[PDB]
């Protein structure tokens, strides 16, 4: 919750929340490039990937 | 009048370490009012009343103080020929001026066959002439600059 | 690179006890 | 003329190639002798 | 030109030796090591670089 | 705060035995 001075100006909302976003990549051939870095984990189910 | 200190701008004494003994040391000074002073229009200052003399000039060498039994200490080593001082030149340099006629635009270069064991980079500019002489002599009256060189 | 190089491979070794670290 | 293909030439009017000389006598023919310098 | 000749004239002006520690005697590298705080010697010999 | 932090590992400019 926060509170902040009225302005009438149009506005919605920003807020930055930080955290690890290591990203790391493989290459095992020549020619192949290839990533290992999920994120936006979860996924199980059978419906709408 | 005035009152200037001039420093060594050599490049073999300027840094050098000299151990006891006597030497003789001269250096000669340049009284050409083209060349040792600058203008801000580049107007020719020998046909203006521009002048200079000297009278006096000191040499002040300023001593370390040393401690006499290490004094000899520092000497002895450096009177030892595995501890010979070595010196480069900043600019390490080979200074050669082609001339460029007016409104010339291909400048070749001719340069005969040397060693070019341990050369470094080519490093060039354009100048701009037709007025002062060149180092040798420092004089020739016929002068027409003085700004920037 | 025009440039100069020095005697410097070799550091001021004193310790908090003497400004000069001595000489045989 | 002077060619329009047959190698790799160019055009400048006076060929020079020198480098630096030493010392005074680099002016002649120019205003006289002033020595101190006087308009 | 011919075959090098220039190489031991370069261990010599140190243009291509050792190092400045090591072309020293070790009594002048130790005095230059006490001194340096007021009465720097660093300047008056060449290291080479390669 | 912030992140992101990475890390590097005689006279002559190189000499190595660095292989497989």
């Keep these: ?49 | 009048p005035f009152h200037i200190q001039v420093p060594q701008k050599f490049f073999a004494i300027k840094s050098l370490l000299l151990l006891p003994g006597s030497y003789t040391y001269e250096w000669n000074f340049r009284k050409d009012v083209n060349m040792i002073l600058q203008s801000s229009l580049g107007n020719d200052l020998r046909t203006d009343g521009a002048s200079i003399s000297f009278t006096s000039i000191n040499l002040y060498a300023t001593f370390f103080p040393m401690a006499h039994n290490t004094a000899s200490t520092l000497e002895a080593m450096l009177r030892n020929d595995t501890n010979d001082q070595s010196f480069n030149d900043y600019l390490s340099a080979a200074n050669m001026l082609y001339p460029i006629p007016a409104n010339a635009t291909n400048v070749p270069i001719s340069i005969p066959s040397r060693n070019w064991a341990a050369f470094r980079g080519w490093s060039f500019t354009r100048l701009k002439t037709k007025e002062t002489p060149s180092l040798g002599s420092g004089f020739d009256p016929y002068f027409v600059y003085s700004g920037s060189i | 690179d025009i440039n100069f190089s020095s005697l410097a491979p070799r550091h001021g070794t004193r310790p908090f006890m003497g400004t000069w670290s001595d000489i045989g | 003329m002077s060619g329009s293909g047959s190698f790799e030439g160019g055009v400048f009017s006076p060929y020079l190639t020198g480098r630096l000389p030493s010392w005074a006598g680099v002016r002649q023919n120019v205003m006289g002798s002033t020595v101190d310098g006087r308009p | 030109m011919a075959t090098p000749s220039m190489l031991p004239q370069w261990a010599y002006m140190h243009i291509a030796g050792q190092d400045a520690s090591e072309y020293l005697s070790p009594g002048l590298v130790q005095f230059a090591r006490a001194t340096d705080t007021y009465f720097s010697l660093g300047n008056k010999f060449r290291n080479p670089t390669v």
């Design chain 1, 1 to 49: 919750n926060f509170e902040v001075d009225p302005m009438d100006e149009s506005t919605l909302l920003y807020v930055v929340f930080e955290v690890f976003d290591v990203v790391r990549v493989h290459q095992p051939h020549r020619g192949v490039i290839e990533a290992v870095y999920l994120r936006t984990p979860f996924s199980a189910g059978n419906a709408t990937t």
